[PDB]
Design a protein around this ligand. Structure first.
Ligand SMILES: NC(=O)c1ccc[n+]([C@@H]2O[C@H](COP(=O)([O-])OP(=O)([O-])OC[C@H]3O[C@@H](n4cnc5c(N)[nH+]cnc54)[C@H](O)[C@@H]3O)[C@@H](O)[C@H]2O)c1
Ligand SMILES: NC(=O)c1ccc[n+]([C@@H]2O[C@H](COP(=O)([O-])OP(=O)([O-])OC[C@H]3O[C@@H](n4cnc5c(N)[nH+]cnc54)[C@H](O)[C@@H]3O)[C@@H](O)[C@H]2O)c1
Ligand SMILES: [Zn+2]
Ligand SMILES: [Zn+2]
Ligand SMILES: [Zn+2]
Ligand SMILES: [Zn+2]
Lengths: 374, 374
């Protein structure tokens, strides 16, 4: 009943940094060639959405943020072959065009069509599908999931199991897959190893889940908020440390705890200082450190390259290294077969209209993931 | 006969920074338990020895430098089982104790007994075997090869083929193995890949040799001294670029030349700026950059961690990642079996007494390796 028509719906528009979202009517254009219009069902609040608000992650404003979500296809543009109306789908904030040198590479996942490295806040064709108060509104990472309806490029959507519980599997669209893949795929955590995870939010807990799945013997959670420790232990941390409790810097503490440095460390916060601390705490000759946290816009870290010369490996990744369109449906299938759990990440559920309360919960330290239902 | 006796011999003593070496008589104590006294046959001039002179690499002075060498065992202390008098040997500036967590790790080589991290300039027992004009003289990296005789710990020496040409295989003690292993073992260069090698001295040329052995399709040499280009092409560079020839930063040039970034880059100079440039020029999603150059003492680089978050891998290594005592004999056997060439690295052969002339050749840009012969 809406195919080929403009849809008026509610979205959460961010007009200005450091302000609440405005829940108000937008116009959503119909999908053009190779585009998909999705009726959203559930979306998570990821710290990267907050980074848009805080100016940590710069993207053009005004904007419809949201990137961790699931929904149902309402209509498809001309030439779409990979989804149909009524399919359950997860928007892919990292696209998989299948054609660029990264998509063709066996390891690569950061498709060259992404809108993260130099955000423009458009569709692939450089235009917007959103109008609000007669004004064009930017997209976010090609997804814009804080809206009852969004339009995405076909390379930014994956079809998932028709029997999927969308209020759970939305987390496969960012935080779970990112953390789990950062452990199992990017770091390649080994059986019997010692891991250190800096930051025990939704992504860091997913890193712990991956470290445990990989058979780590020790998984040391690190957070300045000790309220995060109980859940971290529930999902596999063997011990938790708060840097504020120690006179010495936590890299020294972790090196001593691990009898000379950890096998694998993960920065899952987004601070320059913890990226360097996380590198330093891995064993100097054979340790691996993975950066997951999003750094503050345009800021450089300072480090001593002797940390690398001794033999450390330092890497980072987007979306856990997963090729997004290949991987998302398989992760959903694995979830359905109980290969991993998502409930430990979900601490709060709210209607979409209470999005601002959801962001308050994140900023206060109370929540891990709040799931918003449309 | 000399066994059990102090030897008086000639050595090149460095009394203070930024002065010529002093060629004079030293006293070399006999080996204690688990020590080996070696009559030197040939030693190469590595830029790392010059770093001791320039104060780039801090180690206690006064010192007998030299770490890239080969010689013949003169005597063994109590308890030595791995070499005997008369054996050809290569001193190992990275030891292999076989007992520490690094030596036991499949991918570690930076043995915790090394004297590089926190240089003491002694034997393992904390004492020196050298005196000169009634003063104790420091060791360097447990080797001290700028002397007609040295004493090393057993964990810092490897027995090699009795038919080895020591005036060639001394380069397996540092520069060849470092560069070759940085390509084949640390980076794991792949067939058909594009590599960029920053710095075309003895170590960078050895990196090119390894990239070619690994089947790289393109190997781009980068040096500010265009006199280095002919030999780089002889050993496998497909093209060479001088950053001074370009208006753009060379990372932009290399990204354009490689249609979006190289597969593997190597920093083989020792500059903070080239370490960051070499990281930046590797493909942002799947590129690998290896730091080989020794950085200036206590100086930090500045970089944007988004270079890593997109998917790059950054690592460094000492001695090409090779477990030294296992690997050096095999590299010598491989050389004897014609698996690689050393002559391309050797531009000058001088008597030991001409050490300062050998350093002046390196500093002027006019040599790759000078081999000093005793
Ligand atoms: N690489 C990717 O693809 C990707 C994906 C998803 C999230 N992210 C980023 O990953 C980070 C974590 O996201 P999230 O889990 O949703 O965030 P979160 O829920 O805010 O968790 C961050 C945790 O870090 C803790 N913390 C803050 N400061 C410190 C400190 N100094 N030391 C130790 N702990 C500290 C904090 O208490 C919190 O529990 C954010 O920067 C995101 O932007 C990146
Ligand atoms: N990691 C290890 O185990 C290890 C082993 C051996 C050597 N090293 C280091 O590796 C580096 C190279 O050693 P080497 O090959 O004996 O030295 P080298 O022979 O002096 O070669 C260095 C090359 O870098 C070139 N160069 C200098 N500045 C620049 C610049 N700005 N841009 C591009 N090219 C430049 C220079 O012209 C020369 O050809 C030194 O820092 C050594 O200390 C490390
Ligand atoms: Zn692509
Ligand atoms: Zn996210
Ligand atoms: Zn060891
Ligand atoms: Zn050297």
């Amino acid at each position: 009943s809406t195919a080929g028509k403009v849809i008026k719906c509610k979205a959460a528009v961010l007009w200005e940094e450091k302000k609440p979202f405005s829940i108000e009517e937008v116009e959503v254009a119909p999908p053009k060639a190779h585009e998909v219009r999705i009726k959203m069902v559930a979306t998570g609040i990821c710290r990267s959405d907050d980074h848009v608000v805080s100016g940590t992650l710069v993207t053009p404003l005004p904007v419809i943020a949201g990137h961790e979500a699931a929904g149902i296809v309402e209509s498809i543009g001309e030439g779409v072959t990979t989804v149909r109306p009524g399919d359950k789908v997860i928007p892919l904030f990292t696209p998989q065009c299948g054609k660029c040198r990264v998509c063709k590479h066996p390891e690569g996942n950061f498709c060259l069509k992404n809108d993260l490295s130099m955000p423009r806040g458009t569709m692939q064709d450089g235009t917007s599908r959103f109008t609000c108060r007669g004004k064009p509104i930017h997209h976010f990472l090609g997804t814009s999931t804080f809206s009852q309806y969004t339009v995405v490029d076909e390379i930014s959507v994956a079809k998932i199991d028709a029997a999927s519980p969308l209020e759970k599997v939305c987390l496969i669209g960012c935080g779970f897959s990112t953390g789990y893949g950062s452990a199992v795929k990017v770091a390649k955590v080994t059986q019997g190893s010692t891991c250190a995870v800096f930051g025990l939010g939704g992504v860091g807990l997913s890193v712990i889940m991956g470290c445990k799945a990989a058979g780590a013997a020790r998984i040391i959670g690190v957070d300045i908020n000790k309220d995060k420790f109980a859940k971290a232990k529930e999902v596999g941390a063997t011990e938790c440390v708060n840097p504020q409790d120690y006179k010495k810097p936590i890299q020294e503490v972790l090196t001593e705890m691990s009898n000379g440095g950890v096998d694998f460390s993960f920065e899952v916060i987004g601070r320059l200082d913890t990226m360097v601390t996380a590198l330093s705490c891995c064993q100097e000759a054979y340790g691996v450190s993975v950066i997951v946290g999003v750094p503050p816009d345009s800021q450089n870290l300072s480090m001593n390259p002797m940390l690398l010369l001794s033999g450390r490996t330092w890497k980072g990744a987007i979306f856990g290294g997963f090729k997004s369109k290949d991987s998302v449906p398989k992760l959903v299938a694995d979830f359905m077969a109980k290969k991993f759990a998502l409930d430990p990440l979900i601490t709060h559920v709210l209607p979409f209209e209470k999005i601002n309360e959801g962001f308050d919960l994140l900023r206060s330290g109370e929540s891990i993931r709040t799931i918003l239902t449309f």
